[PDB]
Amino acid sequence: AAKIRRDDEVIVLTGKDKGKRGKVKNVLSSGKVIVEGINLVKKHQKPVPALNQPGGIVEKEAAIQVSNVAIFNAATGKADRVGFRFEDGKKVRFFKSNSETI
Amino acid sequence: AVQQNKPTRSKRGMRRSHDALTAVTSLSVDKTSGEKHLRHHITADGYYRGRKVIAK
Amino acid sequence: METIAKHRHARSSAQKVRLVADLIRGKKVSQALDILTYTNKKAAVLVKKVLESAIANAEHNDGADIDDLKVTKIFVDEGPSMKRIMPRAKGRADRILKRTSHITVVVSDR
Amino acid sequence: AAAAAAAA
């Protein structure tokens, strides 16, 4: 469905940040795309009672739909809607409509 | 001893008249420039002038 | 909110608490007690607590240290009433609603 | 035992 696995370096689309870098992410099958370029401060106080009594009043993910700049190699987007063949046995991921598997 | 039609409104709201509460009004007494409660000297130490209950 | 405090539940019925409230209005404030501390009815012990909490909110939400103020408002409302049963004449005369209220005290300017 | 309580 998403295919975009971890370390998959994508780019921000749709809005807000936009045109930002971001890679890896933490998307999951029917899960969420943390990426790196989506996150405004955060809300949190000093609840932790451990020797590391922090506040977590900072840092956090900004879900956003999987609809981000497709992986992108040269410019941007470049839909990966193609399927390789006779490679692997499980999968056979292809890539942008520019070249072939990448 | 049964009743039959009774007007919640108006009526009863009238008997409530004799139901409001009331106000005290009392002093502080020489020492306590406040409390003194009612016709008592003061509770802080429960003394009218000295060794009564607990004081100096 | 122009420094409030109010309540909710606890249980003390409406009219029961609505009686002691009438005792305090207008001047109030400096009357955090006496016109209340010298009246014993459960309803009284409850309105005073929230009375102080309210007058206390005068050091947090707004300034105006405790000394002026007025308490131009005090009204209790009917709060959800608990239901229970009561063994009696085989089970006919049994309803028992615990009833409860609040107080909602206020302290504005004169 | 004073340190085994005040620190416990």
Place this chain on the structure above:
Amino acid sequence: GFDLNDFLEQLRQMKNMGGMASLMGKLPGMGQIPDNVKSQMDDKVLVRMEAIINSMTMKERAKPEIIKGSRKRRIAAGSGMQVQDVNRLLKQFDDMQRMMKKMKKGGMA
């Protein structure tokens, strides 16, 4: 029969090792990282707590339920800590008076 005046002395009586080898070992079953969190280099808080108390008057040390914002914004000004820091000491102290009253012989079971 207990207050800050006595609780403070318990800190000064820590001259001898202060537990550098005692309390440091009074937890065989360490909770992954309980030790360092308690000792805290023996100065991160172990020393600050004392300083905060030293900046307190004989009245405050006697009665803990008489300190307000007017006093909290003063102790932190002299000690160097903040408002929340001084509050933590009062909180940890409140749980001390409640414990030092519900026992007799060791308090074990």
Place this chain on the structure above:
Amino acid sequence: MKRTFQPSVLKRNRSHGFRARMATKNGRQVLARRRAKGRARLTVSK
């Protein structure tokens, strides 16, 4: 006074309820209509 009940487990089998149900056309019928028809957690014997 004596209110019509008086419990006694032993007196709760062949005399009534329990597993005795498995000894008669109707007795065993009860179980079907009971369990099957409208799944009952049932409990009978305790």
Place this chain on the structure above:
RNA sequence: CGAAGGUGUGCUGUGAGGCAUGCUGGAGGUAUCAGAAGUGCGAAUGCUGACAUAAGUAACGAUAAAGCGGGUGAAAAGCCCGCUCGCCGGAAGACCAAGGGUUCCUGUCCAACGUUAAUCGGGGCAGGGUGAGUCGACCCCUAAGGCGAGGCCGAAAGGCGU
């Protein structure tokens, strides 16, 4: 750049109702002409739910009544300690069966439950707690009675019984 719904208002129709719009509201609605109805409530000692009334009235469960000093606590008439006082004692004591099924003990907490308060409890949440060759059940034995190989009956189901 605010639908249905709720609430106000203004205009409009003979009326059932119609529209325009303030506010609320947070997502949908549907001119028109036609089509089909779980099609329109004030009553049926109607059904369900919510809230009144009486009314802060009656009542707080055996007339064996309790007083005081401490403790604890936000607060004690009721809880813990103590001294008195009174009540039962073929029992209002002790043990067990039946039945109950953790109610037992310790620590805790007081929302709901205790016909009030509750720091207290058979309440909540935790833990802990019932150790058998001689006691009991299993287990041998059989009573009433039950079941019943084969068997005798009986449309079937099934009844009776060695």
Place this chain on the structure above:
RNA sequence: AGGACCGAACCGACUAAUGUUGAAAAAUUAGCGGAUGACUUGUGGCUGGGGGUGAAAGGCCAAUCAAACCGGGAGAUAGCU
């Protein structure tokens, strides 16, 4: 000796008051009858609905009895409200 006498337990219910939204869907209080007998009671068993049991009142058969309770025929029928 005795369906003998008096009288607790135990069994039963003649009278009055109270209760009658009760402490209680039959009791409490003061009296009352039997109390070695057709006595009284624990445990378990057996009789099933037109059927049982009955020192007989149509009484009792789970707060139900001139035909139990539960489910079904069932939306019985209702020239009546």
Place this chain on the structure above:
RNA sequence: CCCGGCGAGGGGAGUGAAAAAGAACCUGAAACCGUGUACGUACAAGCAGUGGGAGCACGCUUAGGCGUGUGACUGCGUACC
């Protein structure tokens, strides 16, 4: 962070487009219960309105004799099914 019993409950601050979304949480009507304000009201008889109607509180307008509320006094006058 602050009141409080280290309660309940709340008040700020912060999250959020909104907390007039706070977990009782969408919209939140009606009965029913309150606080505030304008007027009527303690010598007057009844289905409580309707017809007439002064005064009072606000609103009118370059008066022009009005709008909203309330309604003293007065003719009538026994709910619906």
